[PDB]
Each structure stands twice: as structure tokens, then as C-alpha cells.
Design a protein around this ligand. Structure first.
Ligand SMILES: Nc1ncnc2c1ncn2[C@@H]1O[C@H](COP(=O)(O)OP(=O)(O)OP(=O)(O)O)[C@@H](O)[C@H]1O
Ligand SMILES: Nc1ncnc2c1ncn2[C@@H]1O[C@H](COP(=O)(O)OP(=O)(O)OP(=O)(O)O)[C@@H](O)[C@H]1O
Ligand SMILES: [Cl-]
Ligand SMILES: [Cl-]
Ligand SMILES: [Mg+2]
Ligand SMILES: [Mg+2]
Ligand SMILES: [Zn+2]
Ligand SMILES: [Zn+2]
Lengths: 489, 477
């Protein structure tokens, strides 16, 4: 780690209506008092902002302002603006207009070099002793909007990622089941195809489930409702599946979800005449003109459901919950989630279109941890007593994700286990993101948990096979009489 | 005006024996197929052996050049040691009769289009491979369909009443969507025509679903499946939706790559400005691969595509209720009666013509029982030979005495459309037909709640028993 000081350097001048040369005695007096009083507020001892030099023009008052991480220059300059206005407006009869930036320099500690990228408002970048120096192309509007703080946070993220969070996974085992005998060793996806349970859909990593596979999905759903959601007092809601930029901005997904989303674009207009060229092209060529269509669709409005819970938060956005209403415990099972997974075909263990029950809870810190614990107890009961599967759980501070993993015997003794279930304590992230308050003024937390039916199927069928005679009695009772598939010649 | 359909072509293949060949061709060879001597004929002869042929409707000019491809290969093959490589076109012009001055259109393989005296003249950019693939045939057909539209084609949808329930007293008069918003049943989602359903509204949705399952799907022996929701061009081409569904689709584009370096510029832009760069994102996404679920049943048909069903397997009777349908609706602001994202149970059956018709009647019987006995709504049905759609309509009191009724349910007989489009055959060789019927939960809710209100005390006994105790919503300060 580099110990170099985080430092902000600002060279700027204030716009004046006329030339305030005579008011020099008052101007110099306020700057010295600012350095000992005003610019010190909100900073630890001797870490306040400093005006290092000052000079005058015939319509401008310039300064060089310096700061560390506290009372930053883009914050301190507006403090000096409001003081200089009141001190010179009443007696000296002179008005201060806008702020003009001449140079904005941030110095940030870093161990390694960074490849410079196209980032808005960053003029140039250069390596210096102990870190990185940024030159900013920023005016007063951008300073008021706190652009420098966002640029700093971005560079700090890039610095951390280049050195620290490089390990693919850091993994912490919490609980593991006693190993079981595994007499079934087929890839469940291949067995399901051979025995007429399902077929590949037209789209990438997409499946069509025949009656046999659908029955399995429905039984897992029934188990989650009856063994978890009902006894724990969860209430069904319907969350939207088309997710807008607004939602992902508030959830934080707009910070990097881009490589994995299926994007959605509305038509630019519903006017048939606008689309006639597309229809005509297809009727003549028997080909869909995708290049033309891309020109005729609007810019993306967002994408298809990715994490499932974010669009729910528009229901509580901007609202205050009464203390009587928490914990809010809800779930949704109203449709499909879409993710652009890695290249290479997979089985149902890794699809581009999946079906998940998303479980969401909101309350105080303690109510959220308690709710998480309730969920873990119910999941353990399900996996041990009903599905009777071999499994473990691992934790990827109480904020974070607990992952459930299970072995797939077709992958061999040294095969990688499959993540099939998770429980996430999200802290204040979502309440803060969507501006959801609690009546008592206590901090609101939330958690979520997603049951991916494909992953449960991949695990259960990999371990138990497709023959009901060899399934746990408790699972068999819930399935009922298996339906027949559609037989082909 | 009234012109005669005319084909005109100038091309070459890349002296005494060839001279008598074209005198015979205009009287013997290029005459067969024409009823009253309308066959193809050459007017300009040039020796690269250039031709200029003319034709009407029958014995078309593009077919005429391959007849001479046969004759010149025989009359010069062993005779003068000549072997033709191919044909290249210098000119192709079609003159089509038309009523009115027809709008300017961009169409593939059409170089230029213009209005003339009798109708429309149009030049083509076609080679030999293009006229082998019948491009001029498809261009002609398209333009004729537009000419008939400019002469007759007007905006109309058929209607013929079959059954209407006797008028009922309608004590509840609120727009159910407004009442629902007022009483905390639901809220608008971020997206256009999109709703988030609170526990009270979700309960209603799940009650209708329960009724359909228990009163209709189970007794009739329907088996649940899961149909894909992301629909590709392949599916819509086979289903016929690729002919004109474009104005209503929510298009889906994958990223051009998963490479995070490729997306860094987008993420960095957002982190600094707090504005997602939608213009840049559009350049970085691929061309659309299709769109979100529109009719719901088309993606199922990939399950049976190319297959032959044993006669023991029919009728095939399946349903799906695994997700959302998306549609870009016209007008502006609507309630839940007309949304861009809805939830439907799609019911599909496949069998012989007779079984498909039988299955439809079975469904009509169950819907009638549901709407009369359980929901107790005021409703009607109307037909829109055996192939077609039966629409169920219901009055919404808030719309007034003269209010237009709401379509809330349909049963469609699709004929052989889907088996043909997806190449599904029966073992016995008898024609497969199919039908489908979609239960829209939003629509059922708009009808039921506009007629019965939001207070469970005013709901029919049969509905209240299936609902159970209504959940409370989430209350805000
Ligand atoms: N591609 C997928 N196919 C099927 N189910 C999925 C997929 N991605 C996620 N899920 C389901 O959603 C749940 C929550 O999503 P999450 O983002 O935690 O998955 P993940 O951590 O990316 O798992 P993995 O890394 O194994 O894909 C998962 O536990 C899983 O059940
Ligand atoms: N905008 C909408 N909002 C809510 N529900 C809708 C909407 N559009 C359609 N539905 C539901 O879907 C059902 C069928 O719709 P439609 O008549 O368009 O047939 P389709 O099969 O979806 O389309 P197509 O006939 O092109 O195959 C309707 O009866 C209604 O229940
Ligand atoms: Cl999402
Ligand atoms: Cl569809
Ligand atoms: Mg994933
Ligand atoms: Mg996880
Ligand atoms: Zn979540
Ligand atoms: Zn349909």
C-alpha cells in the first residue's frame, strides 16, 4: 500500500460585476479566518482546506485552494462564495457572480500503473511518486454536482481492482453434509433430452420443458410455498420483468451489469408505414432485415429481468414505512430472468433464460438478520429432509451472500460443485438507493433470496436420477403421479 | 386506367443455325402454358448472344431464358464445341396495371420505381441466381397486394354476436384501476404500460389462475409445459408473425460481446455523470435476435417442429403460464385493461380438424360456467369457415351506458396454420389442426373488478370461497 496523501488542488477565480480593488482589506481578512475557522469545519484537527494564495483583477478575484479528503476544494469554494457575498454585499456594495475554474488537480495514492481510458471530464493523467495525478476539465456546475467525488471514487475502484480484489473467489465454508452414495452418474440434461422431458428452444441457452420437466419445476415451487413462504408469513406480489435504466440506477446495477444483459428496445413508432419497409423486405427475400430493424428501433430503455428484486423497489420508492409495517416480507414468481452467459453450450445448470422465485424482506438491521436466519433453517429442512440431497453452504460484517452448493456426480469426484441457492443480506443499499425511510428514523435494511428452479432440478436430478422409484419418499408424495410426455415417431 | 401486365428482359449468354432457332421458338417452344397465344416472344436479336423477350402473365420472361438455355446447348454443343457458363442480365423491367398513383416504396431487388400511364413501371437488379430463386415472382405478388389495397383495402374487423347475457344491475361505477391505486392494491412500474401488483392484486391474479386450473385445465386433461419467453426470428417466420408484427414488438438485443473492457466506457460514463449513455449503448448492442413473448404459443411449436405424432398421442393438450407477454400498445395512458406487460395462461391443443373443434367447444363450456356461475359477470361472445376467433366481451360500468365493451377472453381455431408452418405431421397422414386460447389475468381483473368492486363483501359467494382471507397491503405514511 502507498501512504501518499490524497490531495485536491484548485486554481479558480470569482466573477465580479466590477473592480473591487478597495475592498482588499476585508477580502484578505476573511481568507485568514476561513483557514482557521470556516474551512476547518467538518475536518479533523489541521486537515481543513487552505487558500494558499490570492490575487486581484479588474473584474475577478482569484485563488489557489488546497485540500485533503475533507472539506474538498469543490466544496470549500462554495463556502467562500457565500461568505464573500454577505461580507461585501452589505457595506462594500459589490456582487459576486459565478465561479471560473482554471485548473483542477487530484492526486491519488496507488501502487501500480493504470491504463488510461475514455472517462468524461478527465483532461489528462500522469504517474507520479506514490500515485496518480488527474487533471480535470470541470466548471462550476460540475463542481456543484460533485463530479470530482465521482471521479475519485471511480479511480479508487480501478486502483483497488488492479491490485487487491484479483483472486477469482474467496470462499468460506460454513456447513457441509456428510457425503452420500451417488449411484446415478448421467448428466441430467442429457438424460432429460433422451427420455423426452425437454428440448432446446430456438434462443441461446434456452429450453422448452415438456410435461415431465414442468411437473418437477412445479413441485419445487410447491415445496418453497408450503415449507418456507407460508410458515414464515411471506406475501405474494407481482414484480415487473422489463427493467428500466431508472431501476438499475437506483439498485446500482447501472455501474457494471452491461456485459450480461439482454437489452430491450421499443419501436420508435407504432406507425405501420414506418414498418412497411421491414415487412416488404421479408416478403420478397424470406429474410428478416435485422440491420434495418436496428435502425428503426429506439435506444434501449433497459433490459430483461436480471436480478428480479430491483423492479419491486419502485413500489416502495420515495415512501416512509410505518414501524407497524416492518418487516415487509414478499416474493414473486411471475416470470423469466435473462442473462447472457458464457460461450459454449451448457445444460439446464447454466441457461440464458431461467425461472426463479425471488424472496425479498425489508426491516431494521436485526429484523433482516433474523429473517435471513429463518430462511436458512427452512432451506436446511428442505434440502436434508425433502430433497435429501448432498450439499454445503459457504459465505462469499453481516452484509454479504451465503451460497448453497451441491455436487453433480456426472462431473466426477473432483468436479466443481454447483451453486443452486443463495441468501443475501444487502444492508442499507436498496433503501438508500430508492429513498425508502423508516418512521422511527432508524436505518432500513433489506435482504433477498432467489430460488432458481433450473438449478434445483440440475442438482436433484443429477443426484437422484429421473426414475421416481428412486426418489425420496417425501419428494415422491409431493410430485403425485408423473405425467407422460409427448411421444414422437 | 387499365394496362396489361408486361415483362421485359435483356440479357446475354456468356450464325445460320441460330437464326432459324428463334423463328421456331416464337411459334412452337415459347407458346406452351399460354391459353390463347399469350406466350413469350423475341423482338430484338443480336450475336455474347443478346436477347430481348416480352411476355404477359403466363410463360414469363424469366422462364423463357432457361428454355433457350436448353435449346442452344443442344444446337451448338456437339456442333460447334461450345459450352455455356451462365447468364448475365442487362435489363429487367416489369409493367403492372394499377388504379391510383401508388406511394413510393423501397423494396429489395427493385432499382427504381415510378408511376406511369397504365399503372406502375419498375426496374430490377437481378442476376440468373435471383431469377432462378423466383425473385420477380415475389416482387410482383407483393405489389399486386398493395394495388388491391389502394383499390379496396380499408380498415375493418368483423363482428357477429353469438350469445349475450341478460342485463345486470351495476352498482359499482369506479374505474377499477383508479380504485386499486387509491386503496393500495398496485402501483405503476417504471416502464411504459407497466404495473407492480401488491398482495391484494396478486391474490386476485392467483385466484383466477386457480379457477382456470381447477375448473377448466384439470377437468379437460391439459398438461402444463414451460414455453420460452424470448422469441427469435426463426419462430416468428414459421408462425407467420414475421409478415407484419413489427410495430408492436419489444425488441431484444444481446450485447455484441461479454468482454468487460468493451463495456468499461459505458460504465465509466455512468459512474461520473449519473446518466446512462443510451446512444452509446445502442451502438454496442447487437442487431435484434427477435423480441419478447408476443402471442405466447409460437415458441412452443419448436417442441414439435419437424416431428411426426403417433395417432395415440392426439389430441395434444397443453398450457403455459411461466411468464410475461410484451406489447407496444397504441394510445397513451391506460389502466390495467390495456398494458405493455401482461400475464397470460396460454392454452394450446393439436389434433385432427374434428378433435380441434371438439376441444374448442369443451373450452367454451368451461368458460361459460366460470363467467356465469363463479365470477357472475355480464358478458357476451361473438364470432370474428370453422377457422377463426370467438371473442368474449364484457361491460365496464365506469365507461357509461354507451361505453364500449372490453374483449377479455378468446378461443381461436387456427386450422392447419401451425402444423404447416412448423412442419408437424400425423402418423396416419390426416391433416393436423390446432387451436389456442389465452387467459389474460389483467383483463379478467379489469372486468371482474369494474363489475363487482374492490370490497370482498360484494363479490359472489363462489369467488369469495376461492379467494380466502384477503391479504393486507403495504401501507405508507
Ligand atoms: N444462468 C443461470 N441459470 C439458471 N439459474 C441461474 C442462472 N444465474 C442465476 N441463477 C439463479 O439465480 C440465483 C441468484 O443469482 P446469482 O446472481 O446469485 O447467481 P450466480 O451467483 O451468478 O451463480 P453462478 O455464478 O453459478 O451463475 C442463483 O442462485 C441461481 O439459482
Ligand atoms: N395490451 C394488453 N393488456 C392486457 N392483456 C392483453 C393485452 N393484449 C392482449 N391481452 C390478452 O391476450 C389475449 C389475446 O390477445 P390477442 O387477441 O392479441 O391474440 P394473440 O394470440 O396474443 O395475438 P395473435 O392473434 O397475433 O397471435 C387477450 O384476450 C387478452 O387476454
Ligand atoms: Cl433486475
Ligand atoms: Cl410469441
Ligand atoms: Mg449467472
Ligand atoms: Mg449467489
Ligand atoms: Zn435479489
Ligand atoms: Zn396463441
Amino acid at each position: 500500500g502507498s501512504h501518499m496523501k490524497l490531495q485536491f488542488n484548485l486554481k479558480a477565480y470569482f466573477k465580479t460585476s466590477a473592480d473591487p480593488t478597495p475592498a482588499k482589506d476585508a477580502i484578505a481578512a476573511l481568507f485568514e479566518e476561513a483557514n482557521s475557522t470556516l474551512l476547518t469545519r467538518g475536518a479533523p484537527e489541521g486537515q481543513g482546506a487552505k487558500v494558499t494564495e490570492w490575487k486581484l483583477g479588474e473584474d475577478r478575484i482569484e485563488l489557489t485552494l488546497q485540500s485533503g479528503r475533507y472539506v474538498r476544494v469543490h466544496d470549500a469554494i462554495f463556502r467562500l462564495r457565500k461568505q464573500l457575498a454577505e461580507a461585501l454585499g452589505k457595506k462594500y456594495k459589490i456582487g459576486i457572480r459565478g465561479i471560473e475554474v482554471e485548473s483542477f488537480i487530484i492526486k491519488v495514492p496507488a501502487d501500480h500503473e493504470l491504463r488510461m481510458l475514455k472517462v468524461p471530464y478527465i483532461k489528462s493523467m500522469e504517474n507520479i511518486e506514490g500515485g496518480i495525478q488527474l487533471e480535470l476539465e470541470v466548471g462550476e456546475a460540475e463542481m456543484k454536482n460533485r463530479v470530482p467525488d465521482r471521479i475519485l471514487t471511480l479511480l479508487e475502484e480501478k486502483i483497488e481492482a488492479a491490485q487487491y480484489g484479483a483472486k477469482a473467489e474467496h470462499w468460506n465454508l460454513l456447513w457441509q453434509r456428510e457425503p452420500m452414495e451417488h449411484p446415478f452418474k448421467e448428466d441430467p440434461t442429457q438424460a432429460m433430452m433422451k427420455e423426452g422431458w425437454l428440448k432446446r428452444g430456438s434462443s441461446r441457452g434456452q429450453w422448452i420443458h415438456g410435461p415431465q420437466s414442468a411437473r418437477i419445476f412445479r413441485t419445487f415451487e410447491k415445496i418453497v410455498l408450503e415449507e418456507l413462504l407460508e410458515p414464515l408469513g411471506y406475501r405474494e406480489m407481482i414484480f415487473p420483468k422489463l427493467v428500466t435504466w431508472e431501476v438499475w440506477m437506483k439498485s446500482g446495477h447501472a455501474k457494471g451489469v452491461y456485459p450480461e444483459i439482454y437489452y430491450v428496445c421499443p419501436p420508435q413508432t407504432r406507425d405501420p408505414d414506418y414498418w412497411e419497409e421491414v415487412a416488404d423486405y421479408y416478403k420478397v427475400t424470406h429474410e428478416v432485415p435485422t440491420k434495418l430493424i436496428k435502425e428503426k428501433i429506439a435506444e434501449p430503455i433497459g433490459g430483461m429481468c436480471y436480478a428480479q428484486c430491483p423492479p419491486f423497489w419502485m413500489y416502495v420508492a420515495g415512501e416512509t414505512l410505518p414501524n407497524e409495517e416492518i418487516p415487509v416480507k414478499v416474493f414473486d414468481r411471475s416470470g423469466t430472468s435473462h442473462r447472457y452467459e458464457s460461450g459454449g453450450i451448457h445444460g439446464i445448470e447454466r441457461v440464458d433464460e431461467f425461472h426463479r422465485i425471488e424472496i425479498v424482506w425489508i426491516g431494521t438491521k436485526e429484523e433482516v438478520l433474523k429473517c435471513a436466519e429463518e430462511l436458512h433453517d427452512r432451506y436446511m429442512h428442505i434440502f436434508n429432509d425433502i430433497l435429501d440431497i448432498e450439499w454445503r453452504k459457504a459465505r462469499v460484517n453481516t452484509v454479504g451472500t451465503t451460497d448453497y452448493e451441491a455436487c453433480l456426480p456426472y462431473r466426477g469426484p473432483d468436479g466443481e460443485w454447483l451453486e443452486f441457492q443463495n441468501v443475501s443480506i444487502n444492508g442499507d443499499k436498496y433503501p438508500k438507493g430508492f429513498n425508502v425511510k423508516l418512521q422511527s428514523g432508524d436505518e432500513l435494511w433489506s435482504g433477498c433470496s432467489g430460488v432458481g428452479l433450473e438449478r434445483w432440478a440440475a442438482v436433484f436430478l443429477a443426484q437422484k436420477g429421473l426414475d421416481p422409484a428412486n426418489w425420496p419418499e417425501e419428494f415422491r408424495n409431493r410430485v403425485g403421479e408423473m405425467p407422460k410426455g409427448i411421444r414422437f415417431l
